[PDB]
Design a protein around this ligand. Structure first.
Ligand SMILES: *[O-]C1=C(O[C]2[C][C][C][C][C]2[C])[C]=[C][C]=C1C1=NC2=[C]C(C([N])=[N+])=C(F)[C]=C2[N]1
Lengths: 248, 110
């Protein structure tokens, strides 16, 4: 995350770190004590030996001895993710559930029919680089960025027709604050009170962008509302699966 | 702006908005309560219903609702949304559904 700030424990309790052989590769969001929602691109050919992945939760410093680390039983990725950029989403089932505490809590999904509000300012968090040619963050960072319309983002001066219907852009035309390398798979959450209580919902999954924080090259996210049914089905269908599975 | 499907934090009873009246109605208990509890939570953006139960208007109260909605169990398993398989009804037994959906999106710090 470029242009963000250090956050504290308990603020973003659904944020987890996905590590492969020790290194933080992607971010993810807890949907329950045992299911994490992240991006499908985090699992290329070379990183599909589940025994080499760990999920780190409940701490904002990567080297906290107080965070918990659990294994992975299965990864269900979207079979329409042609690289294997639309459909860049996957679910990770932990071998056992995380306890839910004041530091570990799941995030909600958008309600049925709930649409994205262009211009609304949401938060994006992660341990990715704080500068493109920089190092990952040691302490989890948070940044507030607005949703940009597709009419603007697909304009020739931004991503000239590369934003497809199930993804959206968020950022400042001016650049300066954005997600970056190492934030992939992480949460883009917006808060609302439609359930009469303020709750944070996962509206996007950090997917890609050109460079980081450049003006007119905002970050692109997977639009979670468009995959609600894919998520409900995947969890019903594969709760007992082990390995890499694909669902369309 | 309120979502048309709500769950009470006092007793988890489900309430559905009736747009022709501007009132909130209860969901009459049926043999398909588990699927209705599950569908209602999903609808609202929760992941699932952890459990559900049946309340009795005579012991629990109406808590500001006006009537019931009954579910078409025959169309129920073809749906994605609740509002499209529901209809006003009398619900003679006066028993309705409560659903405990998985809590989410709230910080629990002091
Ligand atoms: O995510 C990402 C990767 O992903 C790695 C993770 C380990 C297995 C798969 C492998 C491809 C590699 C290179 C770059 C990125 C990435 N770039 C990026 C840019 C932005 C942005 N500028 N908005 C992001 F928000 C997130 C990423 N990830």
């Amino acid at each position: 995350i470029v242009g963000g700030r250090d956050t504290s424990l308990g603020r973003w309790p659904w944020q987890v770190s996905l590590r492969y052989d020790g290194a933080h590769l992607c971010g993810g969001s807890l949907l329950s004590g045992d299911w994490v929602l992240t991006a499908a691109h985090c699992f290329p050919e070379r990183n599909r030996v589940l025994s080499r992945w760990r999920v780190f939760a409940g701490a904002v410093a990567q080297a906290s001895p107080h965070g918990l680390q659990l294994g992975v039983q299965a990864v269900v990725y979207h079979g329409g993710y042609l690289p294997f950029n639309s459909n860049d989403i996957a679910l990770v089932h932990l071998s056992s559930p995380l306890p839910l505490t004041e530091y570990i809590q799941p995030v909600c999904l958008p309600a049925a029919g709930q649409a994205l509000v262009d211009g609304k300012i949401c938060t994006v968090t992660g341990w990715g680089n704080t500068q493109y040619y920089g190092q990952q963050a040691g302490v989890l960072q948070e940044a507030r960025v607005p949703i940009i319309s597709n009419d603007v983002c697909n304009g020739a001066d931004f991503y000239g027709n590369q934003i497809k219907p199930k993804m959206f852009c968020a950022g400042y035309p001016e650049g300066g604050i954005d997600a970056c390398q190492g934030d992939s798979g992480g949460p883009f959450v917006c808060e609302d009170s439609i359930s009469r209580t303020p709750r944070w919902r996962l509206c996007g999954i950090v997917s890609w962008g050109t460079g980081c924080a450049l003006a007119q090259k905002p970050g692109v996210y997977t639009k979670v509302s468009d995959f609600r049914e894919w998520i409900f089905q995947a969890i019903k269908t594969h709760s007992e699966a082990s390995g890499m599975v694909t669902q369309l | 702006p309120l979502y048309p499907v709500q769950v009470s934090s006092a007793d988890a009873r489900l309430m559905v908005f009736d747009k022709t009246e501007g009132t909130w109605r209860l969901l009459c208990s049926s043999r398909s309560n588990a699927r209705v509890a599950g569908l209602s939570c999903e609808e609202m953006g929760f992941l699932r219903a952890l459990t559900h139960s049946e309340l009795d208007v005579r012991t629990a109260g109406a808590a500001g609702t006006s009537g019931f909605f009954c579910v078409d169990e025959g169309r129920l398993p073809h749906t994605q949304r609740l509002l499209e398989v529901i209809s006003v009804c009398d619900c003679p037994r006066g028993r309705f559904l409560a659903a405990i959906c998985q809590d989410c999106g709230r910080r629990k710090l002091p």
